Design a protein around this ligand. Structure first.
Ligand SMILES: O=C(O)Cc1ccc(OC2=CC=NC(=O)C2)cc1
Length: 288
């Protein structure tokens, strides 16, 4: 590459291949994201160069050369998916789960206050470092690029039910839902809703939380992909779904997983929940 050296392919991302690269002029190691291919997206993503926070992966540069587009981000050594897999025998310790959730809510509260959504949070785009930080990767990109950039199998596991029901608009609440699913997975060491198709995803949610109705979600029955023929499942207690999470954690999770997006706790209000009374910032055991 003219301006970098490739150290390795990191892998396939949501928008194209991702490389670990060294800037030829500065020697720094960065994440270089090639966007698999548009004038609208460059200005809008370039505005994300201004969306800086300790819990957001820094966008260093937007490079449009040779009719190719490449995003340059600050490099982090591990993602939460790999850390949860590495931690599977013991689980991630609860103080670290709480630290991670708290920091991720800080990042969402910051982005949401600046009117930027993620829309596609998942453990693979939550990046961690040795100092106990976690950062959200790729905030703002879905709006800017949305939507065909890969043929790789898209994960539906963290998708909010309004989007599975075909609402074509998004709100801050989609990110709270995804983060609630990720919270539950850290605690139980299993994905909460591991669907392998949109209807399997939606029916896994309904089997746990109950089939939604107009009482708990006014407007649900008029949403584009809602069918009156959906089976009617009863809702399970969170005490069964995420043991051994304590009643503070279960209360918070329930507020992150309300069906009606409008009823879902905000990131800012979640930071004030009693669950975070005893929050600390532990050192993670990272094997790199
Ligand atoms: O986009 C996705 O679906 C998954 C994905 C997320 C982020 C990726 O990039 C990095 C991974 C690790 N460290 C970094 O610094 C960058 C690559 C893939």
């Amino acid at each position: 590459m003219e301006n970098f050296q490739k150290v390795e392919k990191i892998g396939e991302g949501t928008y194209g291949v991702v490389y670990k690269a060294r800037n030829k002029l500065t020697g720094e190691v960065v994440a270089l994201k090639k966007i698999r291919l548009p004038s609208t997206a460059i200005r809008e993503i370039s505005l994300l160069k201004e969306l800086n926070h300790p819990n957001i992966v820094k966008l260093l540069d937007v490079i449009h050369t040779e009719n190719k587009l490449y995003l340059v981000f600050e490099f982090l050594h591990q993602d939460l998916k790999k850390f949860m897999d590495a931690s599977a025998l013991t689980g991630i310790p609860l103080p670290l789960i709480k630290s991670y959730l708290f920091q991720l809510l800080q990042g969402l509260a910051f982005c949401h206050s600046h009117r930027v959504l993620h829309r596609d949070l998942k453990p693979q785009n939550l990046l961690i470092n040795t100092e106990g930080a976690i950062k959200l990767a790729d905030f703002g990109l879905a709006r800017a690029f949305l939507r065909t950039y890969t043929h790789e199998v898209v994960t539906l596991w963290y998708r909010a039910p309004e989007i599975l029901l075909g609402c074509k608009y998004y709100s801050t609440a989609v990110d709270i839902w995804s983060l609630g699913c990720i919270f539950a997975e850290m605690v139980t060491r299993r994905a909460l809703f591991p669907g392998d198709s949109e209807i399997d995803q939606l029916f896994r949610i309904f089997r746990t939380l109950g089939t939604p109705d107009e009482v708990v979600w006014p407007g649900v029955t008029s949403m584009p992909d809602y069918k009156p023929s959906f089976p009617k499942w009863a809702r399970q207690d969170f005490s069964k779904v995420v043991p051994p999470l304590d009643e503070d954690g279960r209360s918070l999770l329930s507020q992150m997983l309300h069906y009606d997006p409008n009823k879902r706790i905000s990131a800012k209000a979640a930071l004030a929940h009693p669950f975070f009374q005893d929050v600390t910032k532990p050192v993670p055991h990272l094997r790199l």
